[PDB]
Design a protein around this ligand. Structure first.
Ligand SMILES: O=C(O)c1ccccc1O
Ligand SMILES: O=C(O)c1ccccc1O
Ligand SMILES: O=C(O)c1ccccc1O
Ligand SMILES: O=C(O)c1ccccc1O
Ligand SMILES: [Fe+2]
Ligand SMILES: [Fe+2]
Ligand SMILES: [Fe+2]
Ligand SMILES: [Fe+2]
Lengths: 349, 349, 349, 349
């Protein structure tokens, strides 16, 4: 029950409004809920829809009338009109038309770019051009100048993933505009850092984000395959049966690519069904290849190549593989783990 | 400019709404601002107002009709009706009437309690009673059962500070209800941990929050005084001239009391004016003792004993001491520092 | 068996000597032993002997003819004439006569000074005078200028403990000579750092050694007592029953006082017998107060106030308390733990 | 001067011997030297000598009469007959004859094996066979079962480098004997861990030694080459001009391969002369390929393929490259750095 609804009490309460006081006893339980109950909801975006809307955006929105910001933000139906896939993350399909470019900027927000379709596009990160192609994870960590340049008559689309929504709500955003379109097969960063177990004596200082600008498909495919081959041979390797998986990491540290964002890739042998997990914080997945399904909150949704979905904080989820099922993944887990808020429930266990 | 306002474009845009797409090019700059520009605003609450409203709340709201949650949340005028002092923090004046109690609960949200007026109240934290008195900082870190019990015919008020607003927006909240009202002068925690430079062989494992349940006035006063005395003697000690200051810390680690919240105490020799600072993230201060002023965004506000104010992300601020000026402080700085978002501008420097 | 003792083989072997080759197959097992088997042996030094030899040294060795280096190194009978208590540590009884002084030097070797008998002696550490008295642990960490000055007509003796033997064998030794004999009751360091759970905003940077120059008896006694009182009350605290114990720590970090040396203090309720332990690396203990015994390798030795003993790597040991038994302790454990060589066997467990 | 040589003093001194006391004032300065002055001396071993003595050892010392321990320890002429290359390190040429094997053991001492000549030998490390070939660095970290098996009619030689001398002097040595000779091209470890910037979700826990069992030539060559190519292009990369260099690292951590031992590889463009360095602790180098020289203490020695040399603590050294000069390197630097004893002087700087 509340306090007696008296004239004295309504006066007290008129004073509260005047004085910028809100009394705890008027509040609803869910200011401190039994467990996390997100405003954001589990949602799926069909690739064939995203691709159709992106080609269309490309016709209608050329450069000089919107075309240098041609990204279609996946907006969670529960997040009140904000361009947020979850409370922490932004996820958009950038569509780069034939021969298009962008100038250099920087910002505190951390970003990656995961190539879906296309080749011959370079993103230049602090002056170092990083060739882009299908299955490549690129990084443009906080405060690194990045611009891009298409070298071809062909469109490219990629997932444009950022901690924009965390950064906006917590007030950490900074942004600056900056000052030959070279096309090396491999960036300097990779030429220094993509040799396994080796570290340059000039790179002895640890960094906060990874210095690897592209994690190329090749390597991601080979690791996932070797984990499956090791399963066939009775050797331990997969996280769970028929579930191969790698985390993309900062080689100076062995930790996450950037402070706010985790990236991973999972490959599921056909028939594999994962155990249901409740994880604190939000994750987004994208079907790289194959066919299968997700369950979220008990509800199964069938998935096709390119489809993207979000699991908010604590929503129970699992994946199931009809064919062999490749999935790119990202999450706000390094925020929850850095701050000791992370909890995990797994069904068996 | 935007794309040509054509029927085709309005169709594209009707599809976006249907499909939960929001295009980056429609967005306003301030999704990624030049620097942080908070929705929250600098604001001051006058203690004499908070005290008047608290006594009143005590008459009108007894136990069984709201009285076990008698906290008056300082609500930022810019934060749209949420009981938030800033986007990350909650700050309330809890008013405990004569002989009142509360039962044990726990929650993932981290909390402290800074005693303003009163004595003879124990908060019991995982079964360990912590006597409360004026100038004491108490902790009830995430997931620690806490309840309280007043032992006296006298009211007590304290600042009830939590990371409630961070926890709600990011979805990390959990909460549980729990299962003799002993009155020791000192808690076990303090009996183990409040011996300087000494650590118990049974407490060799590092912890995420501090195990010190009360940081008593005595010690805080003595440290601040010794720093001033050391200044008089030509020895280095103060952070800036006439500006003595301590940070409350976790002795297992030397870091912050809890993962999301920093606490500090500042004592200003009369006449001292601090250099203007822009700091990422938000802080709240409370005048423990003395008289002086704050400048925030260029605007001076005079301050009296008990007055509380908030400096959102990047608002330029300084303090000025007319008499000798004691101030309790807290902030979301460990979140910004844990995630490499922290930046600091200082005027001289 | 060896290779056939042939003229060819003796030639091979004459070549080895010539060429600075020593073949593994000629070596004895104990270049890589089943477990650690120290050259050093368990040994006890009787205080009444150390005191007698120290007074004597004081008569015969005044200043200008040896008296500024009046330390009597405990030399392990197994360590071949080196002034080593163990392979890693040096432990000596420094005897300071009436009014004597020493000038400032520094060195990479880490050092502490544990006051046994005496008062009114200051050691000055980087210009900061640290009053010395009975039961105080003082530090003079690596590379800190230290000199001392006696202020009284009375001798003082203290344990002078260093990582001299580690430093000599591994080649890390550096040494420099340096450039009013003030007598403050408390050093600056302590005035800044001996307030429990508080840290100065000017001391926000972590350090490698502790900045606390004296860990005074007072605090050590109070902690040990509170742990015993907590045992009487059914509260967890002691490491083992009737075994109270603290580790001296670096407050910036919560770790060991200095990188190579651990210090601790143990208080045993009468009747308490500890469980036998095999620990990697060496430790030295000194009976501060009480009467009791040690077992080392199965052999019991009775102990009196001041007596000192060493347990080399892996020697099984325990302590037994006839009266209430106070013991200062140091070891090379931070070297073994830093390098993952530490192992521990305990009898029950 | 000493104390007066009196009968009383000789008595005092007879008591010291009796009582296991050695007085500091009798000691020589160099118990705490101005800077490190090693017992060990700079020394070179000519490969053509090591190879000749190894073939010979192979004839004279077959299996069953010494042949399973056919390693020729490089013994520093200054270290009094111990099989030590420096006070911290052991370095030997293991010579494995046609078809020979060894059974599994383990020990706390950390070890690597750097292949010089040969192929078709597997070392099996905790049951995982690691193919060996020229230029490969293999690890067998502390406490990992390792045995080997030759698969060929051909001898192989490798550098057999351990922290044997540190382990013996400090007393940390443990050793155990253990319980199909499979020949995979690549070990499991490498199949999991040698994909750049990728980490298996089953390997999320940090380790103390690297889990990479072989750092193959291929990768080491490619990194060194790419650093030189990057120099040609005006991009920063080399540690110094014409001086390319990588450190072998633990990918879970980015730190050193094992806690006591650092490994590195340097490639010098012809004509390159390095700046003179004094580094705390000892290092050993082996000419993998090319021709050039070392200066140590001012004395130049010409070097050929395979030649090995040691620079004790603080000996000033530099390398000079007549042709293009490839050098494997190891040191006790992680011990000095872990314990804050490391110091570095460089000539320019
Ligand atoms: O990082 C950027 O360039 C960027 C900024 C805002 C939205 C999408 C993006 O790729
Ligand atoms: O920690 C609590 O008991 C608490 C919970 C919500 C609001 C204010 C509070 O002190
Ligand atoms: O630290 C010193 O002054 C010292 C040096 C050598 C021996 C004993 C000592 O106290
Ligand atoms: O690691 C070993 O097997 C070993 C042990 C002693 C000497 C040389 C060695 O390779
Ligand atoms: Fe950007
Ligand atoms: Fe609570
Ligand atoms: Fe000294
Ligand atoms: Fe071995």
């Amino acid at each position: 029950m509340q306090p007696k609804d008296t004239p004295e009490l309504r006066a007290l309460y008129k004073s509260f409004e005047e004085e910028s006081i809100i009394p705890l006893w008027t509040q609803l339980g869910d200011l401190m809920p039994i467990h996390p109950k997100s405003k954001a909801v589990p949602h799926v975006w069909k690739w064939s829809t995203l691709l159709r809307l992106a080609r269309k955006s490309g016709e209608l929105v050329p450069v000089g009338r919107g075309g240098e910001r041609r990204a279609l933000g996946l907006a969670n139906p529960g997040l009140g009109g904000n361009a947020y896939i979850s409370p922490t993350m932004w996820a958009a399909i950038q569509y780069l038309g034939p021969r298009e470019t962008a100038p250099e900027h920087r910002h505190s927000q951390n970003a990656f770019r995961f190539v879906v379709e296309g080749e011959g596009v370079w993103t230049v990160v602090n002056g170092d051009p990083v060739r882009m192609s299908r299955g490549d994870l690129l990084l443009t960590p906080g405060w690194c100048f990045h611009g891009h340049m298409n070298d071809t008559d062909q469109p490219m689309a990629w997932i444009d993933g950022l901690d924009i929504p965390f950064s906006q709500q917590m007030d950490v955003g900074f942004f600056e505009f900056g000052s030959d379109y070279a096309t090396p097969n491999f960036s300097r960063g990779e030429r220094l850092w993509c040799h396994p177990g080796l570290r340059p004596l000039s790179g002895l200082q640890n960094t906060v984000a990874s210095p690897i600008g592209a994690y190329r498909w090749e390597f991601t495919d080979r690791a996932l395959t070797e984990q499956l081959l090791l399963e066939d041979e009775g050797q331990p390797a997969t996280v769970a049966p028929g579930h191969a998986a790698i985390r993309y990491v900062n080689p100076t540290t062995g930790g996450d690519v950037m402070p706010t964002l985790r990236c991973e890739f999972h490959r599921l042998r056909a028939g594999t069904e994962t155990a249901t997990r409740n994880e604190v914080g939000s994750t987004v997945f994208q079907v790289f290849e194959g066919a299968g399904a997700v369950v979220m909150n008990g509800e199964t949704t069938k998935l096709e190549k390119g489809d993207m979905f979000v699991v908010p904080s604590w929503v129970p989820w699992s994946l199931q593989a009809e064919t062999q099922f490749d999935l790119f993944r990202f999450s706000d887990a390094p925020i929850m783990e850095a701050l000791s808020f992370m909890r995990t429930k797994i069904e068996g266990q």
